[PDB]
Design a binder for this molecule. Structure first.
Ligand SMILES: CC(C)(C)COC(=O)CNc1n[nH]c(=O)[nH]c1=S
Length: 253
């Protein structure tokens, strides 16, 4: 799902291709908005497991006390709101790839259970005593510094060294050269389709601004900017006056 042939991304692509044939755990880091799930899916797609499921568990989009239920499943009646027997992400990912996204959101109790599961493949549904097992290839990702999280006692040390086998550091958007405009063009067409518009090009000032702006929010911020432009304007061409703040203002500091 990655777009672009920039020098730093081509190093990423080589690691993805080599790692895909291995079952070794991948640990993706990088600034917010750099494409960790895109990277995780690309590893799966290049792997011999590509025809099996790819499952992403976003530990941030879930309350911390419910990550275990989302990960391992639960039986009906396990806790108060357990109206149904839920199948965990580990079961959805059996014979495939499981992405543990924003993994550092797990509490230390769940990190202990996860350490067990990563070693043995065994787990229990929440509220159940029965042991089960699955075969998943792990891909971990976080926007925190996984090492600082270990130092501040927030992440298990033995868990870190079990997961940090194949690290991948995604480059920030500002360092990806021609990728910025290529991604911007893809977003322009897609958001035009989503909004019923027909933008097809960027004016030269907009291209210069996009290529020199630091994009602290990376591709997420670029998505915001393109959506802002397409929603608020109707034209074939993106003009400089359409670019929202703080793009020009913070670019000059
Ligand atoms: C239309 C499309 C595919 C650009 C929308 O999807 C996303 O923006 C996902 N993020 C990325 N896509 N492509 C990259 O080269 N890098 C990143 S981070």
């Amino acid at each position: 799902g990655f777009i672009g042939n920039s020098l730093p991304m081509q190093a990423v692509y080589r690691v993805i291709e080599s790692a895909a044939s291995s079952k070794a755990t991948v640990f993706i880091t990088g600034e917010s908005g750099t494409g960790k799930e895109v990277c995780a899916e690309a590893i799966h797609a290049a792997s011999p497991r590509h025809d099996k499921p790819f499952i992403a568990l976003n530990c941030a989009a879930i309350p911390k006390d419910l990550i275990e239920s989302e990960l391992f499943g639960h039986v009906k009646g396990a806790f108060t709101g357990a109206s149904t027997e839920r199948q965990g992400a580990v079961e959805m990912a059996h014979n495939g790839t499981l992405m543990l996204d924003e993994l550092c959101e797990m509490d230390l109790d769940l990190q202990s259970k996860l350490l067990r599961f990563i070693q043995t493949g065994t787990y229990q549904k929440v509220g159940s005593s029965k042991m089960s097992s699955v075969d998943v290839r792990f891909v971990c990702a976080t926007n925190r510094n996984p090492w600082e999280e270990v130092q501040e006692g927030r992440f298990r040390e033995d868990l870190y060294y079990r997961l940090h086998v194949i690290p991948i550091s995604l480059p920030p958007l500002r360092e990806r050269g021609g990728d910025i405009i290529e991604i911007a063009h893809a977003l322009l067409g897609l958001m035009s389709l989503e909004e019923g518009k027909s933008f097809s090009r960027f004016s030269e000032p907009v291209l210069r601004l996009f290529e020199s702006y630091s994009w602290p929010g990376n591709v997420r911020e670029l998505q915001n900017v393109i959506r802002n432009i397409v929603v608020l304007n109707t034209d074939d061409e993106v003009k400089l006056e359409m670019v929202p703040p703080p793009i020009l203002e913070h670019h000059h500091h």
